Design a protein around this ligand. Sequence first.
Ligand SMILES: [Br-]
Ligand SMILES: [Br-]
Ligand SMILES: [Br-]
Ligand SMILES: [Br-]
Ligand SMILES: [Br-]
Ligand SMILES: [Br-]
Ligand SMILES: [Br-]
Ligand SMILES: [Br-]
Length: 298
Amino acid sequence: MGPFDPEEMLFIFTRCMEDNLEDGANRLPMLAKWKEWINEPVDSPATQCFGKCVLVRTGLYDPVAQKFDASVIQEQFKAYPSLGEKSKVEAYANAVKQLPSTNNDCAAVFKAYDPVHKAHKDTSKNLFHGNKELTKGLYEKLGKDIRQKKQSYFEFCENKYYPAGSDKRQQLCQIRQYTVLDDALFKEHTDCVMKGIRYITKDNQLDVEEVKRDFKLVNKDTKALEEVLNDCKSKEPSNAKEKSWHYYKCLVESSVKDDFKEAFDYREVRSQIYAFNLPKNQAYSKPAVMEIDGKQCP
Ligand SMILES: [Br-]
Ligand SMILES: [Br-]
Ligand SMILES: [Br-]
Ligand SMILES: [Br-]
Ligand SMILES: [Br-]
Ligand SMILES: [Br-]
Ligand SMILES: [Br-]
Ligand SMILES: [Br-]
């Protein structure tokens, strides 16, 4: 669901690498290539599924249609005119448009796209926030208005809604202790966070699989979580603005609250470096058990 900003592409690339990198000797060499948009080894199932993953998340390959979709290229260029030359973007979109219908397996999808990737590498890399120089520029222009590399997503949202130096900053003392506030500002902040860690989709829908992913990462079973979320969903408010807050509140107040806090805490840590698990997938152990900007909380 494009267009995608630099953080959104970063999320996609890092997630697809986390899910598809091999775990042995080939991990670091593979990572080093994929990071540079070198989709090799082409004969590797890991590379093939990594490539499929990225194509599916960006919408370049539609697994339901069983076809590639050049729409996202045009959407991306519309949003980021500085990131392409029209004739080159058109050439790239045309190559994708003319790919045949393709089966929804990693090998087929990867094999079909690979010639396009190679024939249009720089065009696609620039357009989808893969050019480090251009992307550095955009991050500098956006500053506080986009989550930055090496910045906790939670902190990004906190700074937006409860800025340092303001009379709002003090609320972080309660907020960071899982106090559920009721006001419009907190609902907006919670929307920022829930969407930033992908528990809520861009279209304001719950993604149960994302929540489950984080529970699993802190070594929890998810049966009770699914039961809780099913109950929460039956009481979803009609106001789209309040959906994220609704699920946050429901989780914090539920019979899975302790596991939720544990999972959410770990997610916060991992949100600070998107490539947290890339060099080697890190085992979780529960950390040892307040100040804001160095100022003690009451
Ligand atoms: Br390799
Ligand atoms: Br190769
Ligand atoms: Br996929
Ligand atoms: Br632009
Ligand atoms: Br058709
Ligand atoms: Br279920
Ligand atoms: Br990062
Ligand atoms: Br890395």
